[PDB]
Design a protein around this ligand. Structure first.
Ligand SMILES: O=c1[nH]c(=O)c2[nH]c(=O)[nH]c2[nH]1
Ligand SMILES: O=c1[nH]c(=O)c2[nH]c(=O)[nH]c2[nH]1
Lengths: 153, 153
C-alpha cells in the first residue's frame, strides 16, 4: 500500500464515522506532483542553472514567438503553471542575463533564447521518461480527468 | 483551451522538431495540485490555524492510534505527503500547544487531538466538494492512473 491507501486504511479504523474515500485521489495527486517536481523535473532544470519556475518564464517567452517579448501580465496568463513570485523570478533571470526589460515588456536575451531552446529538448525527453509507465491511452485518459478536475475549480 | 493545451499548441508552431505531447498531462498534474492546494485545501487548514503541512503531522499522529505518539521517522513514513521541513513543523506545532515530545516520540496533546478530530471532518467534506465534478468512477480511475504514475517514479 502507498501512503494514501495506508492513510485511508488507518482512518477507517480510527474514525469510522468518517468517509475518507476522497483522500486517496487528492493525496496521490499532491504526492505525484511533489515527487515528480522534486526528483524528476527540477533537477533537470537545475542542470541548466534554472530555479523552480524560471523555466516556465523562459518557455513562455520562447513559445510566444519572435521577438519573444511579453508584458508581465501576458507572461502570467500564458504561463504553464500559475505560481507566484513572478517579479522575483524576472529579477533573478535578468541578473543571469537571460531576460531583459524593454517597453513594459519582458524579453528573452539571445543567451536566454539559446538556453531555453536547448533546455526544452531535454525537458520533453525527460518528461516522456517520467510518463513511460503509462500507456499512450493512459496518459490521454489522465489528461482528460485532470482537465475535468481542474475545470471544476 | 487551458494553460497546458495552449502551451502545447504554441510549441507545435514554434518548435515543430519537438514532440510536446507529454507537457499536457504533467502540466495539468502540477497546475491541479497547485490550484487545489492554494485555493481549496490550505484555506481550510488556515481556518484551523494550521500552516501548509502541519495538518499532515496532526492527521498522521491521530490515525496512528492512541496514545498518538510516533518517532519522527515513523512520522515521515506514515505522512500522506513526503514534504520536507519536518523539524520546523514539529517546532511550530509544539509552540502552538498541539504536539509534545516524549521518549524520542512526537505526541498529540489533548488540544492537538481535539483540533485534528474537528479539522479532519471539515477536511474530508471540503475534499468531496473539490472532487464533485468527477463521478465516483472517474475519481477511482483517476486514483488508479495516479498510482501507476507514482509507482513508476
Ligand atoms: O511550455 C512549457 N511547457 C512545460 O512543460 C512547462 N513546464 C513549466 O514549468 N513551464 C512550462 N512551459
Ligand atoms: O490522513 C491524512 N489525510 C489527508 O487527506 C491528508 N492531507 C494531508 O496533507 N495530510 C493528510 N493526512
Amino acid at each position: 500500500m502507498d501512503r494514501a491507501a495506508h492513510a485511508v486504511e488507518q482512518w477507517r479504523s480510527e474514525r469510522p464515522d468518517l468517509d475518507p474515500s476522497s483522500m486517496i485521489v487528492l493525496g496521490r495527486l499532491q504526492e505525484a506532483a511533489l515527487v515528480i517536481a522534486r526528483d524528476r523535473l527540477n533537477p533537470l532544470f537545475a542542470r541548466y542553472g534554472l530555479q523552480p519556475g524560471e523555466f516556465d518564464v523562459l518557455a513562455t517567452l520562447r513559445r510566444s514567438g519572435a521577438p519573444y517579448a511579453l508584458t508581465p501580465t501576458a507572461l502570467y496568463d500564458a504561463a504553464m503553471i500559475s505560481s507566484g513570485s513572478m517579479t522575483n523570478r524576472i529579477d533573478r533571470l535578468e541578473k543571469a542575463g537571460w531576460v531583459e526589460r524593454r517597453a513594459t515588456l519582458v524579453a528573452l536575451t539571445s543567451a536566454g533564447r539559446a538556453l531555453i531552446d536547448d533546455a526544452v529538448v531535454a525537458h520533453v525527453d525527460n518528461q516522456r521518461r517520467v510518463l513511460s509507465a503509462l500507456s499512450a491511452a493512459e496518459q490521454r485518459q489522465l489528461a482528460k480527468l485532470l482537465d475535468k478536475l481542474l475545470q471544476g475549480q
